[PDB]
């Protein structure tokens, strides 16, 4: 999961190519949910990347900690929020028992689980890691709503060279038994003579299939929002799944 080059050599570049509004709205949603859980709030960010959300959460008074399977992400996150709040650790290793009030997994981290069996294992570990009444926020990929185009992002190079850096990206459902998606990334920095291609296999990229899996993992309540706006799921390619553990 954390071994893909996108999250290692290109970890900092991953951040630069993520639209700012995407970060601001989803992070605000998380902080809103933390408030609705009371004070203090113990939060685990599963796949925290460079730790932007952990910073916002900790600045808001949340007892936020994170895990990521990428060594380069952990290093970047620890530089932002210190060493004790971030751990190199796979979501498949989660073994806490009731330690958190809110578990968050944004930006499709959960689909790096190995198939449905892997997803169910991780969701059950997340379920066990939450207190009774605790909640989870999982951002998923609904592959059937993926853009039907190869997308492109251009940004200036290390010394301001215009369009020196390009990413092309393609998301398509795979013809598999279980709903899954091939997420293809191409990275190029022309001035530095860098060219990377990489094909991420993402498992259970279907909002209805994911919700049913969340139920099977033990969550009493499961809600799918179209976005941080909290509208009902309709056409979003990256809806938000909110789950609650029974009392
Ligand atoms: N099995 C796994 N366990 C923990 N983290 C994983 C993982 N597989 C992939 N990841 C991590 O999940 C991230 C997916 S992209 C991260 C962006 C996301 N918006 C965020 O919260 O930061 C990467 O940092 C990658 O290293």
Same domain? For 21 and 52 the reply is yes
Residues 6+ apart with CB under 8 A from 3: 69, 70
CA–CA distance, 13 with 26 (Å, rounded to integer): 20
- With tokens 């940004």, the residue in question is 155
- H runs (alpha helix) in the chain: 11-16, 20-35, 52-59, 71-81, 115-129, 207-216
CA–CA distance, 2 with 9 (Å, rounded to integer): 11
Q: Is the Cβ–Cβ distance between 43 and 100 less than 8 Å?
A: yes
Same domain? For 59 and 130 the reply is yes
Same domain? For 42 and 119 the reply is yes
What kind and span of H or E run contains 149?
none
Q: Is the Cβ–Cβ distance between 104 and 135 less than 8 Å?
A: no
Q: Which one of 170, 187, 202 terminates a domain?
A: 202
Same domain? For 162 and 61 the reply is no
50 CA distance to ligand 1 middle (Å): 9
Resolution in A: 2.0
Same domain? For 179 and 91 the reply is no
Experimental approach taken: X-ray
Instruction: Enumerate residues lining ligand 1, CB below 6 A.
Output: 1-2, 7, 47-49, 67-70, 73, 90-92, 106-107, 109, 112
Residue-range definition of the domain harbouring residue 121? 5-142+206-244
CA–CA distance, 212 with 209 (Å, rounded to integer): 5
Same domain? For 88 and 161 the reply is no
Residue 224 pairs with which residues in a beta bridge?
A: 241
11 CA distance to ligand 1 middle (Å): 10
Same domain? For 83 and 119 the reply is yes
Report the candidate in 134, 247, 122, 215 with the shortest Cα–Cα distance to residue 223: 215
* DSSP-derived secondary structure letter, 231: P
What kind and span of H or E run contains 7?
none
Q: At 122, which CATH number?
A: 3.40.50.150
CA–CA distance, 85 with 95 (Å, rounded to integer): 17
Q: Is 121 annotated as a binding residue?
A: no
Domain count, the chain: 2
Same domain? For 90 and 179 the reply is no
Same domain? For 213 and 124 the reply is yes
Same domain? For 87 and 187 the reply is no
Atom of ligand 1 lying closest to residue 52 CA: 22
User: What is the DSSP track for 54-66?
Assistant: HHHHHHTT-EEEE
Report strand pairing: 130-139 vs 221-225. Answer: unpaired
Same domain? For 43 and 31 the reply is yes
Q: Is the Cβ–Cβ distance between 5 and 199 less than 8 Å?
A: no
Helix 52-59, helix 20-35: angle, nearest 10 = 40
Same domain? For 124 and 27 the reply is yes
Q: Is the Cβ–Cβ distance between 123 and 109 less than 8 Å?
A: no
């Amino acid at each position: 999961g954390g071994g893909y080059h996108l999250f290692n050599e290109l970890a900092h570049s991953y951040d630069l190519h993520t639209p700012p509004e995407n970060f601001q709205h989803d992070h605000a949603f998380v902080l809103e949910e933390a408030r609705s859980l009371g004070t203090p709030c113990r939060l685990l960010d599963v796949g925290c990347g460079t730790g932007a959300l952990l910073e916002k959460a900790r600045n808001a008074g949340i007892l936020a900690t994170g895990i990521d399977a990428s060594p380069k992400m952990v290093e970047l996150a620890q530089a932002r929020v210190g060493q004790e709040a971030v751990t190199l650790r796979r979501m498949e290793e989660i073994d806490e028992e009731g330690a958190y009030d809110l578990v968050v997994s944004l930006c499709w981290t959960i689909h790096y689980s190995a198939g449905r069996a892997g997803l169910l294992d991780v969701l059950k570990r997340i379920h066990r890691a939450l207190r009774p009444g605790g909640r989870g926020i999982i951002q998923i990929a609904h592959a059937a709503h993926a853009p039907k185009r190869t997308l492109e992002s251009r940004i200036p190079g290390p010394n301001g060279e215009p369009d020196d850096v390009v990413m092309l990206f393609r998301f398509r459902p795979a013809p598999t038994e279980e709903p899954s998606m091939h997420a293809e990334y191409v990275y190029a920095c022309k001035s530095l003579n860098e060219l990377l291609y990489e094909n991420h296999l993402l498992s259970m990229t279907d909002a209805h299939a994911f919700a049913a899996c969340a139920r099977e993992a033990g969550f009493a309540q499961v809600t799918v929002y179209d976005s941080s706006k909290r509208a009902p799921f309709s056409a979003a390619p990256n809806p938000l799944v909110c789950v609650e553990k029974a009392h």
